């Protein structure tokens, strides 16, 4: 029996931590909603 609990407002935060790269990938999406890499 699933339930929800509020965790916060949805707002852009100034000076948030900035990280993560920006890869460009060839992918395929199957009928089950699963992504896979195409090589």
């Amino acid at each position: 029996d699933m339930y929800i609990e509020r965790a916060g407002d949805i707002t852009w935060e100034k000076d948030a931590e900035v990280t993560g790269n920006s890869p460009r990938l060839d992918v395929a999406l199957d009928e089950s909603g699963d992504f896979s890499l195409v090589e």
Partner: protein, 156 residues
Amino acid sequence: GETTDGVYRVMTRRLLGSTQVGVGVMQEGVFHTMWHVTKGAALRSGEGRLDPYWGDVKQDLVSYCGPWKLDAAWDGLSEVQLLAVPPGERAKNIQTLPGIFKTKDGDIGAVALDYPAGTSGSPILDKCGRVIGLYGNGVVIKNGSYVSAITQGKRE
């Protein structure tokens, strides 16, 4: 139950203790999450019940109480923020420049940030605070790192 707009944890008591299986967005009276978080089950909000209204396994999305309301899109140039809500931890904003998933049916923005599976459904936002998609359906690349699509639904 609580109908206030915002980001919410999705919890279950079926496993050991109380476990966070994902996250969602309440906007305009509709609760939005990824299909793999709830599998389309009904949800509780205090003494109230939220019933599924629309869903699609291939998009990996589901809306409750009404149709999908989120229609903002990544502009393809700007940095965005993942409003990550990890299990047992406070909501935290993480800024990043999305990468791209290239598919036979078009290109999708993607965020290369790795959080626990229970963070699925966390919103990705633009500089106006609009939700441009949900985090948590993606792939594991060459160096073993996780990259999520920026998954967005269609507002009818």
